[PDB]
Design an enzyme around this catalytic site. Structure first.
Site: not given
Ligand SMILES: CO[C@@H]1O[C@H](CS[C@@H]2O[C@H](CO)[C@@H](O)[C@H](O)[C@H]2O)[C@@H](O)[C@H](O)[C@H]1O
Length: 603
Positions: A286, A492
């Site tokens: 992740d 979240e």
């Molecule tokens: C809070 O910062 C932002 O977080 C998001 C979600 S964290 C993580 O991201 C992966 C790739 O986008 C998702 O597949 C996964 O389900 C999430 O747990 C992130 O997308 C932003 O890029 C980041 O700024």
């Protein structure tokens, strides 16, 4: 003369993998294992570090309003740099296309997963996967970070809408998304092998492994406190279905399972996923997930690299500090801390996926696919899904009342009201255009108000008031009202919410409206929220979840073109003090049990 076996499309994937791996330098190998944000990518970076993958994280776009062709030209620019390396290994580009290709302006936005759970229609979800893969390829992208197969066990989690259900069996049934996105597997297929059918399909990703839906107080970043038995019985089963359907990648959870960080859990990642389920695709971290192994996060990145790569992770979503990652991993291998056998396994898996999916044969975007973006057939499908997702919770204040729904399309004057009746971004919720979603007209779609205006008889006068007072309603000569209220968009870490009450004015508008005229309340939410007061005021009430861009799905049911059929995929609690409280628990005292939903017949 100059024949190179890995470049021969007629050769078996395993022979191509092995032929390429045997030629690669350590820099070339560690590059394959490195995924970076488009925000830090340039041609030189991609070439010089032999980068394996890029992503757009939530909201990471070439510009606001960018066309399908702009996204194609972006992805192809990065690909051209990758294809210019010594070995010419194409990058795979990943994105969260989790309810449609939802970062992209003009993409069809499907209902979020909780509503899809309410449909109990796995073939509908497969078709959504199909359509989503087309819209993803419209933008040149070849990999979707979906499905989220979390089994959300507490609706206080800010990602509960990304879970089809609190019941693992419904989650398992909705793994049909996978062969939608990727294509159906061959009849001879071996469980755990990756599969993608070709250039009109995308690689999928079962996420987040494992027990993301189990986290204490709802919270996450956090501990998932339960035993092997509840891991295996609740949180794990859908991963076996994903193996059986050839899911190409698996993303690891930020969470811990019984105090052990998933990103450092060798027993589950290698012992179970790889060695027991026989997963042969690639395992991705992740976002800064290896960083979060330590407390504070990022405080010993050397340990984060060692621990994650030894645990069995194949590709690291860095996503920004790629130079640090590569340098550290390189040092670890040069020092013997990480054996070449572990690098070679990671690279084997990444190459296996890339070859299988046809990425070496079609590394570049197909301009002819651009018109799949927001295509009207896909919107018709989203409209079907949104309608099927709706759960009718009340349709009459007493058992003797006339049923309010379905409403007549012909009336002299009707009122549409509420904060959610004309707000496309609120009806889509999180992961739409921006990471956390947004307010107002953020993409192409039909609000509830527009849907009403499109459905009613030409003689019906439709009045909109966002927050009318009681007097306005009583004076307006309305036949009925449709009032839409609910939650604002979240993910979240604004959405982890302890009180689960909707923002005001929401209840106050429903009370003012319903006090003056019979009213159908449409509740837009990512989860069950405190609902007694809304029920008490309303003649009828519908849980519409987060229905996406096609608001006519809501009105197709309100006006009786189709009957309500959705059933609750989650328990509706009486109070947040009861939580967690799931179907099959001992102390089970729901306001509405899992599976509840009233019906209507089409008029
Ligand atoms: C809070 O910062 C932002 O977080 C998001 C979600 S964290 C993580 O991201 C992966 C790739 O986008 C998702 O597949 C996964 O389900 C999430 O747990 C992130 O997308 C932003 O890029 C980041 O700024």
């Amino acid at each position: 003369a100059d024949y190179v076996l890995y470049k021969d499309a007629t050769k078996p994937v395993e022979d191509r993998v092995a032929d390429l791996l045997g030629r690669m330098t350590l820099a070339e190998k560690i590059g394959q294992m490195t995924q970076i944000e488009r925000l830090v990518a340039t041609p030189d970076v991609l070439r010089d570090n032999f980068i394996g993958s890029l992503l757009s994280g939530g909201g990471s776009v070439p510009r606001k309003g960018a066309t399908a062709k702009e996204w194609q030209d972006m992805v192809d620019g990065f690909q051209k740099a990758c294809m210019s390396t010594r070995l010419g290994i194409p990058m795979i580009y990943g994105i969260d296309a989790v309810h449609g290709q939802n970062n992209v302006y003009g993409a069809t936005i499907f209902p979020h997963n909780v509503g899809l759970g309410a449909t109990r229609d796995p073939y509908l979800v497969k078709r959504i996967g199909e359509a989503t893969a087309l819209e993803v390829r419209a933008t040149g992208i070849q990999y979707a970070f979906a499905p989220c197969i979390a089994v959300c066990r507490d609706p206080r989690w800010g990602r509960c809408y990304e879970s089809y259900s609190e019941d693992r069996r419904i989650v398992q049934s909705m793994t049909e998304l996978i062969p939608g996105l990727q294509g159906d597997v061959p009849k001879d297929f071996t469980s755990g092998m990756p599969f993608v059918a070709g250039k009109n399909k995308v690689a999928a990703c079962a996420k987040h492994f494992v027990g993301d839906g189990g986290t204490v107080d709802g919270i996450n970043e956090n501990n998932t406190i339960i035993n092997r038995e509840g891991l295996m019985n609740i949180h794990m089963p859908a991963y076996k279905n994903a193996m059986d359907k050839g899911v190409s990648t698996v993303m690891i959870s930020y969470s811990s399972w019984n105090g052990v960080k998933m990103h450092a859990n060798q027993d589950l990642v290698t012992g179970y996923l790889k060695d027991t389920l026989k997963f042969k695709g690639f395992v991705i971290s992740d976002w800064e997930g290896i960083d979060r192994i330590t407390t504070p996060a990022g405080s010993d990145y050397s340990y984060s690299v060692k621990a994650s790569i030894l645990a069995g992770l194949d590709m690291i979503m860095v996503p920004n500090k790629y130079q640090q990652f590569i340098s550290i991993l390189t040092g670890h291998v040069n020092g013997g801390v990480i054996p070449m056998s572990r690098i070679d396994d990671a690279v084997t898996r990444i190459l296996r996926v890339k070859f299988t999916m046809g990425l070496f044969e079609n590394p570049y975007a197909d301009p002819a696919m651009a018109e799949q973006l927001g295509k009207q057939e896909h919107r018709d499908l989203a409209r079907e899904a949104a309608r099927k997702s709706l759960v009718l919770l009340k349709n009459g204040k007493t058992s003797t009342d006339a049923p309010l729904l379905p409403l007549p399309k012909k009336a002299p004057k009707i009122l549409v009201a509420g904060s959610h009746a004309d707000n496309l971004g609120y009806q889509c919720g999180g992961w739409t255009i921006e990471f956390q979603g947004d307010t107002g007209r953020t993409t192409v779609g039909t609000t509830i108000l527009e849907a009403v205006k499109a459905a009613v008889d030409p003689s019906t006068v439709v009045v909109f008031a966002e927050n009318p007072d009681a007097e306005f309603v009583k004076s307006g000569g309305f036949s009925y009202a449709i009032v839409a209220v609910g939650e604002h968009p979240y993910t979240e870490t604004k959405g982890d919410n302890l009180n689960l009450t909707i923002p005001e004015p929401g209840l106050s508008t429903v009370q003012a409206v319903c006090g003056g005229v019979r009213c159908a309340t449409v509740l837009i939410s990512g989860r069950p929220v405190v609902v007694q007061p809304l029920l008490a005021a309303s003649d009828a009430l519908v849980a519409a979840w987060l229905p996406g861009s096609e608001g006519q799905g809501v009105t197709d049911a309100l006006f009786g073109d189709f009957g309500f059929t959705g059933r609750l995929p989650r328990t509706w609690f009486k109070s947040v003090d009861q939580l967690p409280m799931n179907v099959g628990d001992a102390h089970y005292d729901p306001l509405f049990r899992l599976g509840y939903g009233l019906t209507t017949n089409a008029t």
